[PDB]
């Protein structure tokens, strides 16, 4: 990881031009160049929270550096100057899934099937690795917001330290661990797959929550269908949007150890991805 001086990041992106920053960077030497040639970077300004020191935050740094993933973003480098913290990330061109799911159509065209399954796959990926052994970082976050984009569509997790998905223990006793992050993904993949948001006010009332509004659907495969994005019309066969419906019920099980490990929804996932487009 590399360290930056504020005047460094300074040129890169234009000066810090206007959510962060974009900038662009020469690919071998790391050092700015002019804007649209090269490297292009993500500057993310941070401000000290916690009253966090110097030491605290280089180590924190330290750690995410090693968590080398292709379904992370990529931490490129970082500033640490007269009170100055910055972060470098590599730039995803697509932004986030919300862009691609959601948005007041008509001439808007959302993500198709088979880039859903993907997407879905590669987050499952990338949480899967911060739920592994070696890393056991619970992400905390599991959003559509923080599922970036790159410019061939491969879905990463949004920058994180080290409203909308809450798992029923954390709104009841503030529990956060890997079994909320798999709630929150199951949120996240009734999303994917109704392309609705996950809370909506302009919804009805007791249905303003996509699971409350998907529980009487998630009843039967007939009924299931039903909640299916219909603009994704012809493109999936029936028995993977249930499939897809089946691993997000899963992992909305109201009792944490019913749900799924991430590992379990990697594999699920994957072969689902593995054999989509053929009755296999």
Excluded at 106 to 124: G, I, T
Excluded at 147 to 152: E, G, H, P, V
Excluded at 245 to 262: G, H, I, Y
Aim: hydrophobic fraction near 40%.
């Amino acid at each position: 990881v590399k360290s930056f001086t504020f005047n460094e990041l300074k040129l890169a992106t234009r000066n810090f031009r206007p959510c962060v920053f974009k900038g662009w960077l020469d690919e071998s030497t790391l050092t700015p160049t002019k804007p649209g040639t090269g490297l292009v970077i993500a500057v993310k300004k941070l401000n000290q929270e916690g009253f966090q020191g110097h030491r605290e935050w280089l180590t924190e740094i330290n750690y995410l550096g090693q968590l080398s993933h292709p379904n992370l973003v990529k931490l490129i480098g970082y500033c640490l100057e007269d009170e100055h913290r910055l972060l470098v990330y590599e730039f995803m061109q697509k932004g986030s899934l919300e862009n691609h799911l959601f948005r007041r159509g008509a001439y808007f065209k959302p993500l198709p099937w088979f880039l859903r399954v993907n997407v879905a796959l590669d987050a499952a990926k990338g949480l899967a690795f911060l739920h592994s052994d070696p890393v056991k970082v619970i992400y905390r976050d599991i959003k559509a917001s923080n599922i970036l984009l790159d410019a061939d569509y491969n879905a990463k997790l949004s920058d994180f330290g080290l409203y909308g998905y809450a798992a029923p223990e954390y709104m009841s006793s503030g529990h956060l661990n890997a079994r909320s992050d798999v709630y929150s993904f199951g949120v996240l993949l009734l999303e994917i797959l109704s392309g609705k948001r996950a809370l909506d006010h302009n919804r009805p009332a007791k249905e303003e929550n996509l699971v409350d509004w998907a529980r009487p659907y998630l009843t039967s495969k007939r009924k299931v269908l039903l909640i299916v994005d219909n603009r994704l019309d012809t493109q999936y066969l029936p028995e993977e949007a249930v499939r897809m419906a089946s691993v997000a019920v899963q992992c909305l099980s109201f009792e944490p150890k019913s749900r799924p490990t991430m590992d379990q929804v990697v594999r699920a996932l994957q072969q689902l991805q593995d054999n989509l487009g053929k009755p296999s």
